[PDB]
Symmetry: C2
Subunit: 357 residues, 2 copies
C-alpha cells in the first residue's frame, strides 16, 4: 500500500549485508538545533505537536531537506506511552518533561490504563507514521521508536530527569514485586504500540533505554534485560502472525557498556552505542553477528568542519566497513550548528567510500 | 608529631599487602543521611562550616562513633579549590553548588589567582586536618582529598551540575588551548594543596574525577588523563623532597570504565570504581598490581539488612581477598538509613574474614 523504497542502504546495513557506503542518521535530527523546528513547534504546545499528524510529518521531513540522511525517524516522544497509560505530563519550554504526580507507591499503579488499550490511545502516532511514509515517497526508510520499560519507569517514578534515579532504584530494591508489575504493564503497552507503528508504515524500530547507565549489571539483568528481550520477541511474533514482515530492531542502551554482551543476544539486529565505548571494544563484546550503530560524541559537532571530518575518519577506521550504521552517541543538542551536522553526514559518506575502494 | 596509628588495615590494603580482613569506608560517610550531620551543619552555612576546623573535625568523627569504619575522610568539599582560585560559590540548601558567574570565555581566566597562592588560601583545611588527626588519636588513618582538574573545570564552566557538560565539552572542542591553560592552572593549585594536606596530617589522598563519564576515551586521554598523571607525579615528588613519606593515592573516575587500563598506569596505588563495572572485568582491565576500591551500588543500601549482607557477600567473592578496599560505587545519598550503612560495614568485616579462613 506504500511507495517502493528507493534508498535501502540503512536496512541492508541493519540486517548485516554488505553495502556500497556506510549509511548515517542522527538521533534528534528533528530537533531544536534547526530554526525551522523551533518555528513549527512555536505553533502548538509540545504534546499537541505530537498529536497533529501534519506537524509530526513536517518535523520529520525537515532534516532530510537539509541533509542526505539515510533514514528518517518519526517525530514523537518516548513519553507518549506513559501519557497514554493515564499519567498527566508537561513539556513546559525550558524545563523539560515533568509528571507533577509521579508514581510513588504500589497503590499508584491502580491509576494506569489496561496496557491492551494503549495502542488505541496512540492512534495519532500511527496516523503520523502513515502520512510520513506516504510523503517520503520511498526516499529513505522510516524508523519508529519507543522508550524501553526501565527508562519509562524512571520518568514515571522520578517525575522527570534525575542524576541518580534514586527514587526509581529505591523501587527496584524495596518494592521489587511492584517494580516487576510496572515493568510488565509497560512491556504489555509497548508491544502493541510498536506493532502498530509497523502496521502504520514504520520500516525499522528503535528502543531507547536512555537510563540504562544508572543500573549496573546485576539490577540491569534483573529489571531491564528481561523486558527488553520480551519486547523484541513479542513484536516479531505479532508481526509474523499478522502476515507482515518483521523490521530490523535496534536497542540503544545509553551508558550500557556493562550490558553489551547480553544486548547482542537479546533479539535485536542492531545494538546502538554511546560515545564512551571504544568501537573496537564494543565489537569484541557483541561479536560478529549484530550490527553496531553510533557512536560519535555529539559534542564533537562543536568542533570545526575539518576536525569533524577527521574524527569521523577515525571512527570509521575503528568500526570498519561491515555491520555498521553511523550515528552520534546520543541525540543532537539544541545549540548545535546545522552546518556541522551537514559536515558529519558528508564525512561519513565520503570516508566510508574511501574505506571500501 | 602525631599519635601512632593503631589500625592501619586500610593503608596496608592500599599498598597491596595481605590483610586479615577487608577494610571498608564509605564515600560521604560524613553526610546528610546522619541526623547529627544535619544538626551541626544547621549552625553555619556550608562553606562557613568548611572554614571552622572544629566543625570539620566534628563532622569527620561522627560516622566513626556509629560504625567501625577503617578510615576517616576529612569533611570538606571539592569546590574549595575553585573558591580559593577566586570564584564566588554558593551551597544554597536544596539547590546544590552554584557559581553564579561561571567561566565562559578565555578572558575569564584573568580573574583567577596565581595557583601558587591557593594553598595559603586553604589554610583552614590544613587546620582541620591537623585537628582531626590529633583527635582521632591513631584510631584509623585520615584521608585527604580534592577534585581532579577536569571535574573542577566542569563546575567552573557549567556553574554547577549538568547532565551533559555541554558547555565544558564545548570548551574542549572549540577552545582547546584555553582548556589546557585552565587545566594546568587547576593542576598547579591542586599539587601544593594536596602536599599541604599531607604536611598537615593526611595519611592517604583521594582524587575525585566525578565527571569522567561525560568524556569518553579520546577526550579523556587528551584533557583529563595528563593532568591526573601530573598530580600524582608532582605530589609524590614534593613530599619526598620535603623529607616526608608519600601516602597512598587513590584515583576515583566515576563512569570511567573506558579509562581503567590507563588509570592503572597513572601513578596511583588505588583505582576506585563505580558500581557499573563488574569487579572481575575491572580486575582484568587494571591488572594485578594496583588495589581496587569499591564498588557497591549506593542504592543497594535501600534494601533490607539481610539483602545488603548477601550483596556484599557476592561483591567480596568477585573482588577476592587481595588488593581490595571495600566502599560504595559513589557517595551515600541523603535519604539513606544509618542502620543500613552499619549493616554494609558489618557485612564487609564478617564476610571478608569468612573468605580468608
Amino acid at each position: 500500500g506504500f511507495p517502493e523504497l528507493k534508498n535501502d542502504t540503512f536496512l541492508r546495513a541493519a540486517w548485516g549485508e554488505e553495502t556500497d557506503y556506510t549509511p548515517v542518521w542522527c538521533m534528534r535530527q528533528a530537533g531544536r538545533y534547526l530554526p525551522e523546528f523551533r518555528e513549527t513547534r512555536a505553533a502548538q504546545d509540545f504534546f499537541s505537536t505530537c498529536r497533529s499528524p501534519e506537524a509530526c510529518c513536517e518535523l520529520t521531513l525537515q532534516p532530510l531537506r537539509r541533509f542526505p540522511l539515510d533514514a528518517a525517524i518519526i517525530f514523537s516522544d518516548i513519553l507518549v506511552v506513559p501519557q497514554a497509560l493515564g499519567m498527566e505530563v508537561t513539556m513546559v519550554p525550558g524545563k523539560g518533561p515533568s509528571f507533577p504526580e509521579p508514581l510513588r507507591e504500589e497503590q499508584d499503579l491502580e491509576r494506569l490504563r489496561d496496557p491492551e488499550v494503549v495502542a488505541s490511545e496512540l492512534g495519532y502516532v500511527f496516523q503520523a507514521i502513515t502520512l510520513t511514509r506516504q510523503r517520503l515517497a520511498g526516499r529513505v526508510p522510516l524508523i519508529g521508536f519507543a522508550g524501553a520499560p526501565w527508562t519509562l519507569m524512571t520518568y514515571m517514578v522520578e517525575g522527570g530527569g534525575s542524576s541518580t534515579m534514586a527514587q526509581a532504584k529505591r523501587w527496584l530494591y524495596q518494592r521489587p514485586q511492584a517494580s516487576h508489575q510496572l515493568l510488565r504493564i509497560l512491556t504489555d503497552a509497548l508491544v502493541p504500540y510498536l506493532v502498530g507503528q509497523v502496521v502504520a508504515g514504520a520500516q525499522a524500530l528503535q528502543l531507547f533505554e536512555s537510563h540504562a547507565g544508572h543500573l549496573g549489571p546485576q539490577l540491569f539483568n534483573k529489571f531491564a534485560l528481561p523486558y527488553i528481550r520480551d519486547v523484541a520477541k513479542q513484536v516479531k511474533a505479532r508481526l509474523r502472525e499478522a502476515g507482515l514482515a518483521p523490521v530490523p530492531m535496534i536497542i540503544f542502551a545509553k551508558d550500557g557498556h556493562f550490558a553489551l554482551e547480553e544486548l547482542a543476544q537479546a533479539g535485536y539486529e542492531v545494538v546502538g552505542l554511546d560515545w564512551t565505548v571504544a568501537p573496537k571494544k564494543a565489537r569484541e563484546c557483541v561479536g560478529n553477528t549484530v550490527t553496531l550503530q553510533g557512536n560519535l560524541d555529539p559534542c564533537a559537532l562543536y568542533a570545526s568542519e575539518e576536525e569533524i571530518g577527521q574524527l569521523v575518519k577515525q571512527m570509521l577506521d575503528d568500526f570498519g566497513p561491515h555491520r555498521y550504521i553511523a550515528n552520534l552517541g546520543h541525540g543532537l543538542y539544541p545549540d548545535m550548528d546545522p552546518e556541522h551536522v551537514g559536515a558529519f553526514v558528508d564525512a561519513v559518506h565520503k570516508h566510508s567510500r574511501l574505506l571500501r575502494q
